[PDB]
Ligand binder design. Sequence first.
Ligand SMILES: Nc1ccn([C@@H]2O[C@H](COP(=O)(O)OP(=O)(O)OP(=O)(O)O)[C@@H](O)[C@H]2O)c(=O)n1
Ligand SMILES: Nc1ccn([C@@H]2O[C@H](COP(=O)(O)OP(=O)(O)OP(=O)(O)O)[C@@H](O)[C@H]2O)c(=O)n1
Ligand SMILES: [Zn+2]
Ligand SMILES: [Zn+2]
Lengths: 153, 146, 310, 310, 310, 310
Amino acid sequence: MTHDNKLQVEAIKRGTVIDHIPAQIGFKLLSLFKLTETDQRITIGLNLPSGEMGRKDLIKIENTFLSEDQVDQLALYAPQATVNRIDNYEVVGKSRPSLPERIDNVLVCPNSNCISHAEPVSSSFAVRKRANDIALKCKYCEKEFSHNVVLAN
Amino acid sequence: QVEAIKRGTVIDHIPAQIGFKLLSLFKLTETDQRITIGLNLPSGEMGRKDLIKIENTFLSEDQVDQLALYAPQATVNRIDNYEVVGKSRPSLPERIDNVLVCPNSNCISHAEPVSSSFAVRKRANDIALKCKYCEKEFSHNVVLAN
Amino acid sequence: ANPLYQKHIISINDLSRDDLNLVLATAAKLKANPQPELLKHKVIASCFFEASTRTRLSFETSMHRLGASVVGFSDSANTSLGKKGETLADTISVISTYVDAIVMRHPQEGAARLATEFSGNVPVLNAGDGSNQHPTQTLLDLFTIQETQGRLDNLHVAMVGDLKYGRTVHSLTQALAKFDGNRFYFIAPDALAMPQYILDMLDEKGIAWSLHSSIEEVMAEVDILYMTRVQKERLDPSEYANVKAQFVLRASDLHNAKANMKVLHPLPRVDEIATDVDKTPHAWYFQQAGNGIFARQALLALVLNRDLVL
Amino acid sequence: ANPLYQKHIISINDLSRDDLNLVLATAAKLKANPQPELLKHKVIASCFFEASTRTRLSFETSMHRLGASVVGFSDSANTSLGKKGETLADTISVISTYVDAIVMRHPQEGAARLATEFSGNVPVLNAGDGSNQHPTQTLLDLFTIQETQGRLDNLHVAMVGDLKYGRTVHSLTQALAKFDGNRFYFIAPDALAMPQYILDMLDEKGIAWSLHSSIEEVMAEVDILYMTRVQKERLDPSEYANVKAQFVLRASDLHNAKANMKVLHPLPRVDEIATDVDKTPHAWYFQQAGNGIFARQALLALVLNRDLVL
Amino acid sequence: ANPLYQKHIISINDLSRDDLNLVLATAAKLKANPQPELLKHKVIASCFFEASTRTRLSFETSMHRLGASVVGFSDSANTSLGKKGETLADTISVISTYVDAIVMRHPQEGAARLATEFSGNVPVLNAGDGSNQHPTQTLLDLFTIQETQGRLDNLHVAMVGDLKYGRTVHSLTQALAKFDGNRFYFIAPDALAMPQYILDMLDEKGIAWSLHSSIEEVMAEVDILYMTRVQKERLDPSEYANVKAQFVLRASDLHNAKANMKVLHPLPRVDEIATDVDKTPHAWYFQQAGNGIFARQALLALVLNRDLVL
Amino acid sequence: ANPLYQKHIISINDLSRDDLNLVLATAAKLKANPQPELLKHKVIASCFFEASTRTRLSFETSMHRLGASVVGFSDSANTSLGKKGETLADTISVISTYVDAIVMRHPQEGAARLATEFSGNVPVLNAGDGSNQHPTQTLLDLFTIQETQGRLDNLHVAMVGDLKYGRTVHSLTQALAKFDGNRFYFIAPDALAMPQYILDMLDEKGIAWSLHSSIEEVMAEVDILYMTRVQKERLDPSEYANVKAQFVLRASDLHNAKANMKVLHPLPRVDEIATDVDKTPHAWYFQQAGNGIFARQALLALVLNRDLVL
Ligand SMILES: Nc1ccn([C@@H]2O[C@H](COP(=O)(O)OP(=O)(O)OP(=O)(O)O)[C@@H](O)[C@H]2O)c(=O)n1
Ligand SMILES: Nc1ccn([C@@H]2O[C@H](COP(=O)(O)OP(=O)(O)OP(=O)(O)O)[C@@H](O)[C@H]2O)c(=O)n1
Ligand SMILES: [Zn+2]
Ligand SMILES: [Zn+2]
């Protein structure tokens, strides 16, 4: 309980707040990282006014603490987000995402002939070379693509 | 302290887990307006629920009746100056476009640039949904299951 | 301008009683005085994405008997379309750029109605879409019941054979349910029974029907006996053979048929109607196929002509 | 007698500027007042040794719209010719013994010009010979540039796609180089670049061209954007995908297009032009295909008629 | 000698309760203490006139783990024997002069029984003959049921799917009906239900059976759940997709099953068993396919070796 | 155990310099003093979902020279597994309950790596997976280079042909780049040149490479000349035939080669190597294909046998 309001809503006790999500990445992250399949109270604010991006998104998941590698999976979508972990209304922890070494499940091999399309295996890509612009190599067909390309097909 | 809004739509009493379906399916986030969503909201009042608040947007008539297949006991509320100007329950519509797949794998809707469309029919015990291409009629439970 | 003018004939469920009578009275007039130049200078596409000779030769002869030109393909065995992922929306957006009506058969249900969303103003007439509709087969059967019986109402119509998957008996039961007092007798192997959505529509309209297990139970009362082929793969070889291959008609069975009774079969008949039935007055399966010409001609005349001269 | 009278239309390199204008002004007249009996009593052979539905249905509809009869075959999948080693000289020496013009497509380059040495006086019109020519596709594209732009000279024409093996962009660059002041922009993956013999002919005629890597670099200045399909097997699956599948047009890209800009694609389009482009005023790919009828009609009218009435 | 020494293995109908237990007893022995030189110098023929590579690899691996040699073939659209003209009887008469045993799978029923009259003293083992029999599948199913449940009597076995045409479900019911007190639940789409002959036999034996509509209503009482694949050709796409909220199994459905309940499937399992079942302890179809090695080793060992002391 | 004992052999990328030398060391041992009962009682599966009979016979002969048993298949337009519906994952899950090792060649990339997650403790050895990897070809190429040159470091290797799509030339360059001081010459048609990733890797390692236009300009400095076949589908006939005075090798071209220079080719060699080369001492492609036996014996011996004392 603390005086919420909607331009920057307030206080969950205990749980995670992913703030400074670029506009329109928030829903993407909800659906992609399946954040919603929990019985916990999630509160989400879309296209909000704030700390200078002007407009941002924010997600609040009480009682769940998603961390260290979970936070890193957020990196090519929301690299400039902050993952505050809250306990008894205090921000006892502030993480930011860094590029992971493996991004499972979420991507799709652009190579139409690899076997991963047709089967009970989940995608997996090795990540290379920070911010000057990322290369992702499929586990299975060992073909290396530009992230800009895996992030459309 | 949560979100009282000046003008907009508030969908309330979404049945739990339909809450995220509806954002996806009805493409409600593709907007620049402030949306504030609540999931697994407490409802001693109705078990547990979800609730989307979308401002400066009024979702009406047709748009409200769509939701009935999913959240049939949802009360949409509009607001134009800080309070409920209308509460609107969803009624079942006569046609459900776009969001639904034909169960029929030989139906041409599957391979083509076509928007799906089903004619709705409350045959007591269920709603049958007849595809506009096939003309094959299925229980709404078979189509929503997928 | 006539009601059917420039319409798409996609489903029987879309034609009213009125619409069906109009087509049938025009067939009767064209059968009586030919109009060999009515569609002079029209070019019509015969697109058979799935091959069907019986239906194609019939449709194109009747386009030829009203003076129209035909361009088209028969496929199933390759004729370069869908080449390199080309969608059906796109093929039809290109064919309607130059023909005046598209006749089409396609493997998937719904394909003629999709063609409709892309053909602009060129009418699309459905010659069969998978297990869904075949209007022009129901129009010819109806025409044949009418011409031989004198009416389309107050009939006793027996449907014998594979009723579960026979796409033509399902549409003829829906068309005939548009008219009054018809009584249906279904005679099918248990595995091949008339589906519930049919029965449920008959009940709801207060139309009488009943299941019988042999044609002898009902021959005496019957006006139209419509036979369908059982396809031997809807059953195993021994199911067909074992006791269910007795939905077969022979001359002997016709003894007590009313003098007006006719035997109809959309064809290929292979087993079900023995060759000795052909010599009887009740064999009307071949004359039914010849009526396909006038039914089909009538639809192309009504759809391409604002006003019809007769 | 008109210049084209009884000529063989085998290659674009054989038609002059004058010849190309004449065909285009006749197309414009026949599109404006039909001449449905001009080729009355002519019989024309549609020989498609290689199947091509799009092209065949178009060619035969336009033979039908001028009143001619068509006999012919589509093959690739067997229609008994070359049966038992019969040469193409021999098939053509026999077909020209009874038809009045041969339209033909064939897998090997040179085949329509060989037909010419054996057809006597029956004109041979080429509907495609392997990777060599396709005149009637260039005539229809030209007609469409002319009708939408008002001219064929002083154009800014962008050619986007697989330019190395797209047999139609190579002929349209040669035809357009017949006219003045056109400027070419080629946008191709490195593996699929416009070959040197093209570039070398443009340089030698003093015509301006340039390579760009995205359509955004040139959209603002462009009148005709001619897209071609990349065939996914000219590249491996991952080459296509990896960064080269971005020669794809979408509605968003059209923002700054001039109000007169048109998008042309010989078709099947499958990937390269997104479906939302269709709703824009610039989508002219389908109306381009309909113009195939008048371009094609005009060539058969000019080649079979000594004098033309208009 | 052992009772099955030099015997022909053609129908499950022909093996007594006792022969079924002998085979199963042996196969546990060979699984535990393998004897890789038991058929040293024997040459078995793997005549698959109908391809089934899973069954063929299981058998040939059974032949080689006992040290035997293998000659033979498979024939999806290929290799000479049976020809058309050359009879099966002459194929067998010639091959039984070359080998010591013949495993055969043929598309027509009774082919293996015909073979038996032409192989001389050479034993023939049926690997599938049309829709009639496949005894080595029943033998491994019982070995898996006996190896997970501890007995073959007093079981609550649920059989699910295409009970009308799964040859495996017809056989497994005959074989389990030689043991005592078994109770059967048959969950099938009523168009694909257990034939009246299986049921009439079961009532002559006094055995208990009941028919159910979805697995969820028996999940609680069951020991073996034997899923079958529903054969979508014997169905309409819309029929196929219509049934209830299906008869496919997922882990969610398993949350009530007894701890010793195992899900069996002859394979392939396209659709009816979801991947999440694969990780539960109740999943046993892959282990069932490995027991195929020990069941077929057993049969070959008893048929070709006079008495066995392992 | 040995380092490769029970390991999966899927990409050349995954074997260290040391593992490459162990294999090559073993293979010289087996060539010299053969051990024909080393895999006695093992049963290997030769799953060629894509036919390649040369590779399949090399492997099965490797399996039999070490005394192992073989079950499996090939599949140019044939035999059941993988079906369409039945997954590769379920095929492997079932076959890895029957055999001790799986050699597999599949048309889609990563199929062997997928397999690895379903074979349990059973090792899988890649025989080719789309355009990705074929490690047993690289292993025999290095064995032939080491056996003719005496070392695998400090070589002047010329690679010629389709460097863009030969999977073998991509692999051989990664493997030779784990050894020291090698200098690479790449003589290819610029439309078919070495990808930028091979070259970018080679420059990160400090390795020397240069690109040339015809073999004649490096003939003098070279040790290994590795010809590749130019794949005429990825080319126009006229393009194919246009290149220089070609990149095919004939004895005349060899008159300057060093005495220890050997010409290697993975085979087939339709055109690029003339028959007169076959009689020179520099020809070594056939001997290279015999070393395929000793390279694959080595891999199987180390994977299935715990430590090797030969
Ligand atoms: N019990 C609490 C405490 C804080 N917050 C959230 O924590 C987020 C940020 O943490 P904080 O350090 O308290 O505010 P800032 O200093 O602005 O964090 P930053 O500078 O990283 O944006 C705010 O969005 C606030 O809503 C919360 O929901 N519940
Ligand atoms: N300025 C306002 C006014 C109302 N609301 C929302 O509008 C909804 C309408 O409910 P209301 O009629 O105010 O009382 P309820 O009893 O909650 O409606 P119901 O009968 O459905 O429970 C409430 O959830 C409230 O949050 C709002 O967000 N902003
Ligand atoms: Zn991949
Ligand atoms: Zn449908």
